[PDB]
Amino acid sequence: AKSARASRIKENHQRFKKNIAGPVEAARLERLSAKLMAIAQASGVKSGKSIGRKDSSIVFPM
Template sequence: MAKSSRASTLKANNQRLKRNVFGPVEAARNERLSAKLLALAAEPKPQKDIEMNEEPVEEAKDAAAQKDDSTMEVDGAKPASKKPSGKKKVEKRRGKKSSIVFPTRGPKRNKK
């Protein structure tokens, strides 16, 4: 018969493995991760230069005008409808039902 997982020798071996093999590996991983996080925290945050009162640059206006000129408008064209692009319903295939029909049994009769 096999030894159960509650056997004292198996529990002792597993504890020894955790302490001697997996323990140092996990500790080294924690050291690497903490060093990486400290390095990220020490870096200065990038600052965004946004001024609300500044007018848009003329080049941006010209680019927008060129983009509008290149598109064609069609009279009577329907605008594209925006439907939610969620998950589509998956239809499950149903197995074919058997064409064999077994007769139902009447009341059970005692055979002697």
């Protein structure tokens, strides 16, 4: 019997993933993303535009 880690079995699984299960997963993911988007939609220093510093070691201390 061909192994699970066999090159031809892997190629067959890759073709299955590309051609058959791929569109189904894409359509399901698009529907779920739309449903979650429904719930989701339903100076620089003083304004946060300039990302400043927050308010052993890599080098030898010297």
